[PDB]
Amino acid sequence: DDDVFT
Amino acid sequence: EIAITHHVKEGHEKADPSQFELLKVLGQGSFGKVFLVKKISGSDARQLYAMKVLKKATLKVRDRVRLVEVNHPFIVKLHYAFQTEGKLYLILDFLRGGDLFTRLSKEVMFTEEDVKFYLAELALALDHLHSLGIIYRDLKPENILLDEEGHIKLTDFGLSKESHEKKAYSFCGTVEYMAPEVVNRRGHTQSADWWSFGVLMFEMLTGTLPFQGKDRKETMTMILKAKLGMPQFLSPEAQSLLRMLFKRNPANRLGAGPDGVEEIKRHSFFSTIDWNKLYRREIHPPFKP
Ligand SMILES: C[C@@H]1O[C@@H](Oc2c(-c3ccc(O)c(O)c3)oc3cc(O)cc(O)c3c2=O)[C@H](O)[C@H](O)[C@H]1O
Numbered sequence: 251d252d253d254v255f256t
Numbered sequence: 257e258i259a260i261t262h263h264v265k266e267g268h269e270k271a272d273p274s275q276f277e278l279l280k281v282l283g284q285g286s287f288g289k290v291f292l293v294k295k296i297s298g299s300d301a302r303q304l305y306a307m308k309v310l311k312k313a314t315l316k317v318r319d320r321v322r323l324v325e326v327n328h329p330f331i332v333k334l335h336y337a338f339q340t341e342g343k344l345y346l347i348l349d350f351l352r353g354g355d356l357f358t359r360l361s362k363e364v365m366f367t368e369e370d371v372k373f374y375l376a377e378l379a380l381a382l383d384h385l386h387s388l389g390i391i392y393r394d395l396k397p398e399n400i401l402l403d404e405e406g407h408i409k410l411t412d413f414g415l416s417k418e419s420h421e422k423k424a425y426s427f428c429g430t431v432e433y434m435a436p437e438v439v440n441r442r443g444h445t446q447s448a449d450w451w452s453f454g455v456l457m458f459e460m461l462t463g464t465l466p467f468q469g470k471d472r473k474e475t476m477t478m479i480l481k482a483k484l485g486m487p488q489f490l491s492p493e494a495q496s497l498l499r500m501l502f503k504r505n506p507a508n509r510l511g512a513g514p515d516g517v518e519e520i521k522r523h524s525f526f527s528t529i530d531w532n533k534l535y536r537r538e539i540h541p542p543f544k545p
């Protein structure tokens with residue numbers, strides 16, 4: 251995933 | 257043992273011990289025995305420097321990516337590094353009464369207000385190194401010093417603790433601070449350093465590292481694939497900056513666009529920083545050594 255958080 | 261990485265500029269005038277007049281011997285606490293020396297010849301003739309003489313250290317020399325060089329307020333430079341009779345000589349900017357950032361980090365609990373100051377000076381320093389053609393790859397707290405007034409001094413040189421059956425590597429870094437593309441050994445653009453900047457920010461704010469496993473293999477896996485819980489005590493602005501730095505695709509990361517570090521300086525987390533006053537060393541650090 252490009253987004254690490256959430 | 258210690259490995260020093262010297263990022264040399266094009267046309268580096270290689271040196272040797274006879275080019276330095278010895279002026280003082282100091283005890284500098286965490287820096288140990290430091291010699292104050294005066295350059296005898298060449299373009300920087302008469303310049304004063306610190307000298308370290310290391311007996312168990314390796315030297316790696318790397319090209320910068322890339323004018324007479326000027327001092328930056330938040331960087332200490334390695335000017336010369338040469339080997340002689342089992343000794344490694346380091347010629348450095350003299351840093352009177354300097355200390356380690358890791359020493360401060362162990363003693364204090366940083367607030368967001370504190371972190372804004374240290375990360376602002378570090379961003380100026382890191383971007384200046386990018387402009388000189390130096391990409392860190394594994395920027396980490398060991399690279400961060402503090403001067404006698406408490407201001408950031410980022411080292412422009414590399415430092416690793418590298419250990420015969422183990423095959424040597426040209427690059428051995430600390431995995432916890434490495435961007436995914438660095439972990440993969442598939443890219444190392446300046447955008448990789450802004451990921452490491454985010455790791456530093458996260459560690460300052462929480463006292464913990466965002467990615468850490470039982471071993472270097474599990475840490476790699478987490479850097480590449482883990483979904484992280486964002487700590488909810490952080491301000492909306494701090495959370496936003498961390499989210500924007502922790503993008504796995506280096507092209508999507510804050511700091512990777514054409515305006516580079518200005519994308520970070522414009523972020524709401526730094527909205528209280530006067531970047532010109534900061535560069536002039538007119539803003540007092542949260543902690544005085
Ligand atoms: C090469 C390093 O030299 C000495 O510390 C200095 C450092 C330094 C750098 C990074 C570290 O993580 C660290 O622990 C120390 O940096 C200097 C920078 C200067 O501009 C002038 C100096 O004298 C030192 C200076 O004397 C210390 O002996 C240190 O153990 C050694 O690794």
